[PDB]
Structures are given as C-alpha cells and as structure tokens.
Design a protein around this ligand. Structure first.
Ligand SMILES: Fc1ccccc1Oc1ccc2c(-c3ccccc3Cl)[nH]nc2c1
Length: 343
C-alpha cells in the first residue's frame, strides 16, 4: 500500500498516492471529476478520475463495475485504457471511492478541427478504425462515438474514450445526437457494432468539409437530413425495423433516391468519397466493418495488417445479472485489488 495524501480540489477531497503530483482540474465538469497530474513513477502526464458516489444505488454500483471492467480490458494504442486504479480504503468495509488513471491527452477532436488536409483525415480516421477494430473484436459497442470523446496528443496520436457506457440532452440542435446512426436515434431495432461505423462516417465527413454532416434541429429534422443524403429505405430494410410504430412513420415519408456523394463532398479525394459511401449506408447489415475499412485503398499509406491487433474475449455476462449494491461493490473491489499495471 502506497502512502496517500489529501487535497481539496473539485470541491471535494482527493486522496491519492504520493506518486501523483501537481493535481489540477481539467475541463471543469465536461469529463466529470477529472484532474491532470504528473506520475513520478512512470514520468507520464496522467488524467485521474474520481468516481462520484459510486455505490449510491444499484444502477450506480453496476455502472461503476461496468466502467472498471471496460477500462481494465482495453489494451490498445488507440483506446483509453487503465494505467492505474486505486482506493484509499484499506478494506471492503470502508471502500467508497474509486480513482481511475489513464494518459493525459492534449485536446479532443472538437476543439482542434476546421476543414483538415486529406493526409490528416487519413491518419485520424485510420486510428479511430484501428481502435474500433480492437473494441469490436471484444464484442463491445461504443454507442456514442463523436469528436468530443476522441482525444488527441500533439503528434496527432488518437485514443477513443467513453466506450460501452437522458432524453433532454439528446433533444434539439445538439452535438450529442448528430453522430448517431438512424436505427439507434429512433430505436428502430436491436443494433449492431456498425452503429459506430455510422458515427465514423459522420466524423470523417466533418473533418473533410469542416461542417457537421447531419446537424438536425431535432430527431425528425435530423432523420430527414440523413434520408436526403442516403435515400429512403426500401422494402428490404423496412422488414428489419421491428418497431411497427417507427416502421409506420418511415412509410409516410416521400421516397428519395441516394445522392451522389461526389456532388456532396466536392473536391475531396475520390477514395475518401468511396469510403464514406460504404460507411454511410442506411441498412446497418450492409455497412463496412472496421476491419474491412482498414483494408480500404484510402488507408494505403498507414494500413499494416500485422500492426492492427484484436482484443482478448470480453465476458459481459454480468450485464444480464441482477445483484444488490453490496454485491456490485464487492465485485468492483475485487477488480481494484486484482489490478496489475501495464509494463
Ligand atoms: F480520467 C480518466 C481516467 C480513466 C478513464 C477515463 C478518464 O477520462 C478522461 C477525460 C479526459 C481526458 C483527457 C483530456 C485532457 C485534456 C483535454 C482533453 C482530454 Cl479528452 N486526457 N485523458 C483523459 C481521460
């Protein structure tokens, strides 16, 4: 057990091992209770997240467990993983705080991008897909990929944040919804991991043009923006919309053909255009996968199939489990105590 020291920061008492020095709040509120710090043990600038009231309810205790499990599994250059996890508690009895440690990045993709060069788009999208291939290989879905949870350092090296984890914040003219695949935005069906490929398409388009692809003013306005670009669904896809209510609304819409992406993305690399066409497909069954996308000619200067690793299997059976607060807490505690730092 290291020696811990106390400090008041984000209106709360942070108790961290001595190795972590110069703690300073970052993005006040945006990422939660997060401090930047210097890790004297590794020489890395780190981000430390203190979990807010982790075992307050069953739902909170389970998502604390969920976040720790997810962060513990991810070991990839392009995915946020866990450098360290600690609690000041000496036993399960006094266990009530969880601190997570990962790399400190420079900024997010939002406050860095306006229309980029094709070479920068290539590199940035390649890294997203490299990390996504890894995530998807573990049968994990990100679900909420957007520029604000893609973090970049000064070398343009990229890591994905917030993978696998309210109605009001999805309402209106909001970036929280602009990158969502239509089938998840309107709950058409049980969705696959290519909801994340849709998001990549939206992100890639924005890097290339400097403009939000589908900046809808609400769910419906956004759907119309989407269907204008990609066309209205045919009979084949309509069958796959198990939501009879959602299916019925779609059929009320005036049919529209898919637009010419070369006339939408004027001046862009024809290989970029082709890839966008394969990512931004209405039917999720027919979207390109991350592994397929990495082999696309657009990424010829970066692609290396021996340097695009996959993940170990990820047991998420706990998701189907109904446990008590103290049971989720004990499982969380086991995971903290059993943590082994990377080499
Ligand atoms: F603090 C964290 C610990 C473990 C997992 C995730 C955590 O959340 C963040 C939140 C923001 C982070 C940043 C960051 C730092 C400055 C500007 C933007 C960003 Cl995304 N670098 N690393 C981060 C990690």
């Amino acid at each position: 057990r290291p020696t811990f020291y106390r400090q008041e920061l984000n209106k709360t008492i942070w108790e961290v091992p001595e190795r972590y020095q110069n703690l300073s709040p970052v993005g006040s509120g945006a990422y939660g209770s997060v401090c930047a710090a210097f890790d004297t043990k590794t020489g890395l600038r780190v981000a430390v997240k203190k979990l807010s009231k982790p075992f307050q309810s069953i739902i909170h205790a389970k998502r604390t467990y969920r976040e720790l499990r997810l962060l513990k599994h991810m070991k990839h250059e392009n995915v946020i993983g866990l450098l360290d996890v600690f609690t000041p508690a000496r036993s399960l009895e006094e266990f009530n705080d969880v601190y997570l440690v990962t790399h400190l990045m420079g900024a997010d993709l939002n406050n860095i991008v306006q229309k980029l060069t094709d070479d920068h788009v290539q590199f940035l999208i390649y890294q997203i897909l490299r990390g996504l291939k890894y995530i998807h290989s573990a049968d994990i879905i990100h679900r909420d990929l957007k520029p604000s949870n893609l973090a970049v350092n000064e070398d343009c090296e990229l890591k994905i944040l917030d993978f696998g984890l309210t109605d009001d914040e999805m309402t209106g003219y909001v970036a929280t919804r602009w990158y969502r695949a239509p089938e998840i935005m309107l709950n058409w069906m049980h969705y696959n991991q290519t909801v994340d490929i849709w998001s990549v398409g939206c992100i890639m388009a924005e890097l290339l043009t400097g403009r939000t692809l589908f900046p809808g003013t609400d769910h419906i306005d956004q759907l119309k923006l989407i269907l204008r670009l990609v066309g209205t669904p045919g009979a084949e896809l309509l069958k796959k919309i198990s939501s009879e209510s959602a299916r019925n609304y779609i059929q009320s819409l005036t049919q529209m053909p898919k637009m010419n992406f070369a006339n939408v993305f004027i001046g862009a690399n024809p290989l970029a255009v082709d890839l966008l066409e394969k990512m931004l497909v209405l039917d999720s069954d027919k979207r390109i996968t991350a592994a397929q996308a990495l082999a696309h000619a657009y990424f010829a200067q970066y692609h290396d199939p021996d340097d695009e690793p996959v993940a170990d299997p990820y047991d998420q059976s706990f998701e189907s489990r109904d446990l008590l607060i103290d049971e989720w807490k004990s499982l969380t505690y086991d995971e903290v105590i059993s943590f082994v730092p990377p080499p």
